[PDB]
Each structure stands twice: as C-alpha cells, then as structure tokens.
C-alpha cells in the first residue's frame, strides 16, 4: 500500500496512512553545494541533524469561509531551534526543505486544499500606489491569510484569493511544486523542495526564497453534529543546510 509512508529527518519522524505519493521539487532532490558551483571561499558549516529536522509551525483552523493562508521561508523558521540560530550568526545560507501539510477530517466531511510552493513569490500591495511592509509579507511562524474579497490596508498585501496576491490566476498555481488535500482521499501533502535560486547561496532574512500557500478550492463542509474544528498543521524540515560568513548574531 503506497497510502502509508514514513519520513525520518534528524530526531523527528512523521507518519501517514493516507498520503498521495510525494512531489519532489522540479524533479530534483536537495543536495549540498558542489565545488564547481561554490563562490564563498570559507569552509561552510553543516549542522546536519541539528538543523535538518521537522519543525512544526502554529496550526491553523479551516473554516467554511476560509480563503487561504501563506508562509514565507526560510524567514518563518527564524526562531526554530538551531536552524534559526545559524540564520542569525551567518551571512549566507542554503537549504532544501521537506514541506508536510497535515489535515484530517472524516468520510463525512468534504473539502480540497491546494498545497503549493511558489519560488520568489513577490507579492503586491493593497493600495497599488503604495508599497508593502515586511511585517505584512511574513510574520514568523504566524500565518498570513487570504481574503475572499479585496483588501484596503496601507502597506498590506492584496489578500484577495483569486489573484493569489501576485496578480495572476489561482488556477494556474499548479505550475509550481504542489499537491492537493482532497479529504475524501487525502490526509496530508508532502513536497520536497530543492534549493531554487539564481545564486549558489543567499541571506535568509533579507530574501524569502519561496512561499507556501494553502488555498482551498473546495469549501470545507459537513452536516450537524460533525466535528466543526478542522485544523491544518504545517511541518517543514531543512535539507542539506549549509552556512557561510560567520559573524555576530543579527539583532531582529
């Protein structure tokens, strides 16, 4: 049975009895930087099991009127164990990441989520005449959510779902590494993202390599007396984490 699967990274292990295979980035699997592609001359540090493990973020509640959510990495993991510590003390970073979104219900509930990883998910502002604030793009492990209607915020992100806050069609986000969580068949979604960037390495605070978006295309629904609380938890584990440029920790 390919339904059941097990994931093991570091001192963490995830279990599943209702998965749907595993999407591996753009056909590639996380790998350390090679010598014929490196730029930083200093010998990198590789904490390995210390940083490459499963980090669970704050759960989110899926409601009949939920429009979606989104996280930005590696920023969202700035306060996660040693992975966040290396981000502070190092100028350059490089990691893989294994996204694992969980969400279970019952054979009597219905709904369908879209777990996607969007590289360089540059987003727009609510007020097209102004700019956006980092605080409105990503706020730690705290998820930002999409709205079923237009936003008005000064420096807020245009959370209107239909445009995914990028000025595009949500139905075309399938062009990015993704999976769906169709409650009647699924229970979770896993995506192994390889380091994608136009540079061997990059800062992890200044640059948001990719954005994880969970947009429901099939509204959550159910009958009376059926558990109304359906949470959606996101777990991610860095892979082949390398760091360069060691210096005094950065004051957030």
């Amino acid at each position: 049975s390919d339904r059941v699967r097990s994931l093991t990274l570091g001192n963490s292990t995830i279990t599943t009895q209702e998965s749907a295979n595993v999407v591996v980035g753009y056909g590639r699997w996380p790998e350390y930087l090679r010598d014929d592609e490196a730029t930083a001359e200093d010998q990198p540090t590789q904490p390995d099991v210390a940083t490459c493990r499963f980090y669970t973020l704050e759960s989110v509640q899926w409601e009949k009127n939920s429009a979606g959510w989104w996280w930005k990495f590696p920023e969202a993991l700035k306060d996660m164990g040693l992975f966040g510590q290396n981000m502070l003390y190092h100028y350059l970073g490089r990691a893989g990441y294994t996204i694992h979104v969980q969400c279970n219900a019952s054979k009597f509930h219905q709904g369908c989520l879209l777990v996607v990883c969007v590289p360089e998910a540059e987003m727009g502002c609510s007020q097209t005449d102004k700019e956006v604030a980092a605080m409105n793009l990503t706020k730690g492990e705290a998820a930002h959510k999409f709205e079923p209607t237009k936003t008005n915020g000064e420096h807020t992100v245009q959370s209107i779902v239909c445009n995914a806050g990028m000025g595009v069609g949500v139905g075309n986000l399938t062009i990015y590494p993704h999976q769906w969580i169709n409650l009647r068949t699924n229970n979770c979604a896993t995506i192994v993202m390889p380091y994608v960037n136009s540079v061997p390495m990059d800062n992890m605070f200044r640059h948001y390599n990719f954005t994880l978006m969970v947009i429901p295309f099939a509204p959550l629904d159910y009958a009376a007396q059926a558990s109304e609380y359906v949470p959606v938890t996101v777990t991610i584990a860095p892979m082949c984490a390398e760091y360069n440029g060691l210096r005094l920790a950065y004051q957030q």
């Binding site: 700019e131 705290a142 079923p148 420096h155």
Partner: protein, 158 residues
Amino acid sequence: ECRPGYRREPSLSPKLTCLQNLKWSTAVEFCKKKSCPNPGEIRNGQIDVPGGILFGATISFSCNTGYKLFGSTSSFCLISGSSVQWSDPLPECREIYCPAPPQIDNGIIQGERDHYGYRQSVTYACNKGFTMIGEHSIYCTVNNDEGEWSGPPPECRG
C-alpha cells in the same frame, strides 16, 4: 537603565567607560525596543505591517472587497503603563449587503434569499404565459462600501 518602553539585551553591558581620549566608549544595543503583541487577524480584512510591530511601529487595516471597515484604519504601538500596547483595537469588516432585490410584475425570483452580498446573484422567472425581456439575473456589485445591483431586473410581457 532601559527607558520606556525598551528592554535589556542580556548579551550586552548597559555600561560605558570614559576612555583616555575623554570619549565615552561606543554604546551597543543593550536596550532594545519592546515588541508589541501580534496584531492578530481581521476576519475578511488585512493588516498592513510596513515596519514591524515593535514600540513606535504603525499598522494599517483594510477590508476585502464586499466588506466595509468599522473602526480605526490604523494603530500605533505606544507605550502603555508597564509595556508597549497597540493604540487602537482591531476594526471590523462587516458584509456589505445589496438592497432587497426588486419584485417584478408577472415574474418571480428563483430561490430568493434573505441577504445578498458581493457577487451573489438573483435569477428571475416569468410566470406561465409571460415572456422574459432582459437578462435573467442581476448581481450584487459593491462599489463603494455600499451595495448595488448590477442593473435593472428583467421584465415580463404577457
């Protein structure tokens, strides 16, 4: 000693030394800005964080299309007593409703509803023996924080 509202940085000395050159030693960030509470979430709204949420920071609010904002359009992280606190509470984004759809002579509305919000629609149907003149449906448009039907209802000619 940290001012209000700042907090001590355990990794640094809140002390200064008078150097031989009669200059005080370079000061570090031994006292940093106290961070404000996480603004939270606005149902059918958005919080704009232009410059973080620490003391002195500002945040603006907006409501998605189809919702009207009720309350403040912004909040400042001011110092409140023993800590930094948001100046104004989170506002409210209440659904904009269209006026009751119009009833038409010799026709009905199919599956008439209680309320009608942005993008919702009403489809008419002429009674037996009558013919529909115009579009079957109209749609609740919500420019501009006030709800309005897209156009006029169809008409039924006998």
